Assembly symmetry: C6
Homo-oligomer: 100 residues x 6
């Protein structure tokens, strides 16, 4: 429900390579969880990777503090990706390490 989490403009890295400037994304801590996000070659490349680390900028308007980075630590999908924009994904842990 409101146990949601989402963040503006982000980038996902496959073991070090940036692979898609993923825009709006919105997860759901179930810190394992499910979520969704919308995303050139590189990006798409990165997507195929996350299919098989998404580091964005948190968009909590409440601003309990200010604005921090959010990372989302951690095959059908792989095939769907062979050709809507809201793609599903399932991180295994989330985090808000630094401010900004």
């Amino acid at each position: 429900a409101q146990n949601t989490i989402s963040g503006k403009e982000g980038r996902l890295f496959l073991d070090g390579e940036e692979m898609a400037h993923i825009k709006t994304f919105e997860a759901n801590v179930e810190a394992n969880g499910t979520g969704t996000a919308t995303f050139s070659k590189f990006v798409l490349l990165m997507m195929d990777y996350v299919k098989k680390t998404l580091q964005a900028v948190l968009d909590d308007q409440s601003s309990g503090r200010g604005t921090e980075r959010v990372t989302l630590y951690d095959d059908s999908a792989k095939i769907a990706s062979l050709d809507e924009e809201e793609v599903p994904f399932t991180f295994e842990d989330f985090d808000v390490p630094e401010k900004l």
Copy 2:
């Protein structure tokens, strides 16, 4: 129904520590009541606290007077919070102490 109450940008304090710059929130005096509100570490931290004092700025457009502060005095939720943005909550008393 219209026995509602809501306020723009607010902050909730857990025994003295600010823990989430909670944005739009909207309660419902049943001054005990139920409500909802949408909210980094600190904020989220504060949320886990209110789960187990929300002091915002009233947004009554009628402006019967001007603009005053609203405080909302005073586990499943705690678990939901482990990972939408509209979170539920149940204050035990509300108040409009000062103007602004």
Copy 3:
């Protein structure tokens, strides 16, 4: 139906005390009638009063003339008010005394 009536920014007075800067309101001559309106301490105070004279500025776009004041002459509600924003109310007479 169209036998409606409504007016922008208004104020309701309880025997002389202003008690809520009530924003948008919209009545319905049945000049007795029913209506609804959306509304700090003072305002809320005034509300508890009207629960048990709303003088606003008419918002008829037709502008058959120009812009005049509208007054709305003249317990469950009282209890609902102990904690949505569209509150119901039932004036016993309406009026458009002066221009502006």
Copy 4:
């Protein structure tokens, strides 16, 4: 259907007295027909009259020509009017006499 007709800001006259600056109105030649329109004292006064000549400015965007005046030549309603804004009405003839 599309056999409609409507015009921006208008005024209705009861045998010579302007009685309501009626805003958006939209009729329907059945040049007798039915229609609807949304509309201080004077205006409301005029309304009670038309209940028992609406001269506006045509709002045909097609602009087959330019912009002309539209007049709408020629009791339950009377009672409804004792207290929504879209009021019904039934002209007995319409016209687009002059340009502007």
Copy 5:
């Protein structure tokens, strides 16, 4: 479906007389076809004529080229027109003769 066609601001001529500055219109090649369009005296006059040549400016955003004129070559309707704005009509051929 997408075998549609439409064009901004246009004018329809009855054997040489302009008779309505018809705004947005949208046809459908079935180059015979059906369509709809929304449209003072003159315009309305022209309408009664087309009831019994619509030359507008094409609004294809794809801009496969640029912006060209569209003409639409070539009684119940006649009666409906005696008093909504989206009127139906059935051209017998369409065309995009010149650019602009």
Copy 6:
């Protein structure tokens, strides 16, 4: 679902001739796939061709990289096209060759 792909302002070429400045288009890798897109003479001409190579500018907001060109390599439709704007189509391969 999110295995979608779409791109702003594009142009489709029939063996070398530009034939329609096709605006918004949105495909779906099933890199063969199905899709839809909305599109003067030339454009329409090109359309009749693709009916029987669409090269646009990718609109991935995620911006995993920046902004690259997207090409979509490779009769009922032909007939529908004889007269809505969202036309269907079925590319046989997609591509994001260069940046921009």
